[PDB]
Design a protein around this motif. Structure first.
Motif, PDB file in Angstrom:
ATOM      1  N   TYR A 127     -22.764  63.634  66.036  1.00 21.39           N
ATOM      2  CA  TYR A 127     -21.810  62.530  66.160  1.00 21.39           C
ATOM      3  C   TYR A 127     -21.143  61.954  64.870  1.00 21.39           C
ATOM      4  N   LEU A 128     -21.614  62.333  63.672  1.00 22.05           N
ATOM      5  CA  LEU A 128     -21.082  61.786  62.391  1.00 22.05           C
ATOM      6  C   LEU A 128     -19.752  62.369  62.066  1.00 22.05           C
ATOM      7  N   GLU A 129     -19.575  63.624  62.450  1.00 15.93           N
ATOM      8  CA  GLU A 129     -18.402  64.400  62.068  1.00 15.93           C
ATOM      9  C   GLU A 129     -17.312  64.340  63.125  1.00 15.93           C
ATOM     10  N   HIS A 130     -17.585  63.634  64.222  1.00 17.85           N
ATOM     11  CA  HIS A 130     -16.665  63.575  65.355  1.00 17.85           C
ATOM     12  C   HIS A 130     -15.361  62.957  64.928  1.00 17.85           C
ATOM     13  N   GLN A 131     -14.290  63.285  65.661  1.00 14.84           N
ATOM     14  CA  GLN A 131     -12.924  62.855  65.331  1.00 14.84           C
ATOM     15  C   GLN A 131     -12.355  61.723  66.222  1.00 14.84           C
ATOM     16  N   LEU A 132     -12.557  61.803  67.548  1.00 13.28           N
ATOM     17  CA  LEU A 132     -12.070  60.752  68.477  1.00 13.28           C
ATOM     18  C   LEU A 132     -12.863  59.459  68.379  1.00 13.28           C
ATOM     19  N   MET A 133     -14.188  59.544  68.548  1.00 11.95           N
ATOM     20  CA  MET A 133     -15.025  58.373  68.309  1.00 11.95           C
ATOM     21  C   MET A 133     -16.369  58.658  67.636  1.00 11.95           C
ATOM     22  N   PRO A 134     -16.346  58.895  66.302  1.00 11.96           N
ATOM     23  CA  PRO A 134     -17.550  59.244  65.531  1.00 11.96           C
ATOM     24  C   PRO A 134     -18.499  58.075  65.339  1.00 11.96           C
ATOM     25  N   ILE A 135     -19.790  58.406  65.295  1.00 10.77           N
ATOM     26  CA  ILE A 135     -20.870  57.450  65.038  1.00 10.77           C
ATOM     27  C   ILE A 135     -20.677  56.920  63.627  1.00 10.77           C
ATOM     28  N   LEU A 136     -20.472  55.606  63.537  1.00 13.66           N
ATOM     29  CA  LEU A 136     -20.100  54.970  62.269  1.00 13.66           C
ATOM     30  C   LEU A 136     -21.313  54.725  61.363  1.00 13.66           C
ATOM     31  N   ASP A 137     -22.494  54.631  61.984  1.00 15.17           N
ATOM     32  CA  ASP A 137     -23.778  54.557  61.268  1.00 15.17           C
ATOM     33  C   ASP A 137     -24.142  55.925  60.657  1.00 15.17           C
ATOM     34  N   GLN A 138     -24.556  55.918  59.393  1.00 19.92           N
ATOM     35  CA  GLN A 138     -24.749  57.156  58.662  1.00 19.92           C
ATOM     36  C   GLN A 138     -26.169  57.721  58.650  1.00 19.92           C
ATOM     37  N   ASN A 139     -27.162  56.932  59.050  1.00 17.53           N
ATOM     38  CA  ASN A 139     -28.520  57.459  59.238  1.00 17.53           C
ATOM     39  C   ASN A 139     -28.610  58.356  60.421  1.00 17.53           C
ATOM     40  N   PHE A 140     -27.694  58.120  61.348  1.00 19.77           N
ATOM     41  CA  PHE A 140     -27.841  58.567  62.708  1.00 19.77           C
ATOM     42  C   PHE A 140     -28.367  60.000  62.830  1.00 19.77           C
ATOM     43  N   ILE A 141     -29.424  60.170  63.621  1.00 25.08           N
ATOM     44  CA  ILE A 141     -29.889  61.500  64.005  1.00 25.08           C
ATOM     45  C   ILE A 141     -30.389  61.435  65.432  1.00 25.08           C
ATOM     46  N   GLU A 142     -29.876  62.299  66.293  1.00 26.92           N
ATOM     47  CA  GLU A 142     -30.323  62.313  67.677  1.00 26.92           C
ATOM     48  C   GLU A 142     -30.164  63.702  68.265  1.00 26.92           C
ATOM     49  N   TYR A 143     -31.097  64.086  69.113  1.00 27.69           N
ATOM     50  CA  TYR A 143     -31.018  65.352  69.817  1.00 27.69           C
ATOM     51  C   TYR A 143     -31.175  65.060  71.302  1.00 27.69           C
ATOM     52  N   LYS A 144     -30.814  66.020  72.120  1.00 34.47           N
ATOM     53  CA  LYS A 144     -31.117  65.895  73.502  1.00 34.47           C
ATOM     54  C   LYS A 144     -31.632  67.248  73.943  1.00 34.47           C
ATOM     55  N   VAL A 145     -32.422  67.258  75.014  1.00 35.58           N
ATOM     56  CA  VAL A 145     -33.102  68.461  75.446  1.00 35.58           C
ATOM     57  C   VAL A 145     -32.740  68.737  76.899  1.00 35.58           C
ATOM     58  N   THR A 146     -31.787  69.622  77.143  1.00 38.83           N
ATOM     59  CA  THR A 146     -31.448  69.961  78.535  1.00 38.83           C
ATOM     60  C   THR A 146     -32.435  70.974  79.144  1.00 38.83           C
ATOM     61  N   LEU A 147     -32.652  70.887  80.465  1.00 39.18           N
ATOM     62  CA  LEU A 147     -33.487  71.869  81.176  1.00 39.18           C
ATOM     63  C   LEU A 147     -32.658  73.058  81.532  1.00 39.18           C
TER      64      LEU A 147
END
Length: 290
Positions: A170-190
């Motif tokens: 989300y940090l590098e996103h163009q339309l609506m990037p995560i403005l917080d710079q610590n940000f780290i998140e993953y998701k795990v799909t089945l």
């Protein structure tokens, strides 16, 4: 944002087609003085065609708004046609046009599907069928749930026999990037909706504990775990409550799939147990820190 931030209906050919917004129509509307009575009515810069209703004023990043979206970027249109192809694939009624368009969605989930549809190595690029399905879901217009095959995306940082783990970019996103710079998140799909062996389950859990030991294993109630750092479970708790708050509004069939207790962090399972079962804010909140 609401779907109506991106497109507007058009009763043409005896049914409803969705046309995307010109970033300058929007830009024009943002400077308009309008009557209180038409604040929810589609705007008309005469130069750049139709715009969204001037009530969505704050959903757009402006000079005095850093909290909205960057509608001027290439990303904007891309998302907008993404949504547009999807909706036009449904035949939408007068009955629904309003809730469909007022439907609160994830910009970021959609931008990741853009990035997927476009990279030739992804099947999405090749199977339109599959593309639609991934869009319809993120847009909340399909029975189905997010499998891996239909996932928002990012970088797979681990793949299993019955899971695929995505790093959310989300940090590098163009339309609506995560403005917080610590940000780290993953998701795990089945990988599929089906039953999962103790081999696979333990593997996933082994991975989560060696590699990502510093991360909370949570869920927002659909078929998959988001993998947040421990300082966010807070904001996550409040948001998840608020959407179960709008249960006081039926049609929101609140099937909160509190997934396998084996993977879900224990306190999240406690917290989510109370809420899904009618408890108040605070007896829930207290389960999480105890």
């Amino acid at each position: 944002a609401e779907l109506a931030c991106f497109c507007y209906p058009h009763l043409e050919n005896d049914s409803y087609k969705f046309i995307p917004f010109n970033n300058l129509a929007i830009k024009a509307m943002l400077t308009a003085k309008v009557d209180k009575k038409d604040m929810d009515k589609f705007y008309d810069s005469i130069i750049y065609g139709i715009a969204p209703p001037p009530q969505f004023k704050k959903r757009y990043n402006t000079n005095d708004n850093s909290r909205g979206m960057n509608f001027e970027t290439i990303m904007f249109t891309k998302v907008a046609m993404l949504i547009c192809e999807a909706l036009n694939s449904l035949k939408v009624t007068q009955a629904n046009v309003s809730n469909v368009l007022s439907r609160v969605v994830s910009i970021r989930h959609l931008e990741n599907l853009v990035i997927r549809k476009e990279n030739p190595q992804d099947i999405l690029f090749h199977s339109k069928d599959l593309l639609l399905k991934s869009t319809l879901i993120a847009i909340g217009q399909s029975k189905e749930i997010e499998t891996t095959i239909t996932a928002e995306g990012g970088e797979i940082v681990f793949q299993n026999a019955a899971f695929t783990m995505w790093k959310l970019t989300y940090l590098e996103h163009q339309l609506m990037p995560i403005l917080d710079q610590n940000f780290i998140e993953y998701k795990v799909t089945l990988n599929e909706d089906k039953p999962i062996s103790d081999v696979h389950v333990k593997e996933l859990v082994a991975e989560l504990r060696w590699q990502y030991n510093k991360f909370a294993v949570i869920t927002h109630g659909k078929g998959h775990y988001r993998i947040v750092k421990y300082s966010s479970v807070a904001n996550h708790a409040d948001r998840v409550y608020a959407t179960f708050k709008s249960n006081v509004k039926t049609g929101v069939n609140n099937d909160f799939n509190l997934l396998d207790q084996r993977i879900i962090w224990q306190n999240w399972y406690a917290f989510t147990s109370s809420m899904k079962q009618g408890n108040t804010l605070d007896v829930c909140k207290r389960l999480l820190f105890q």
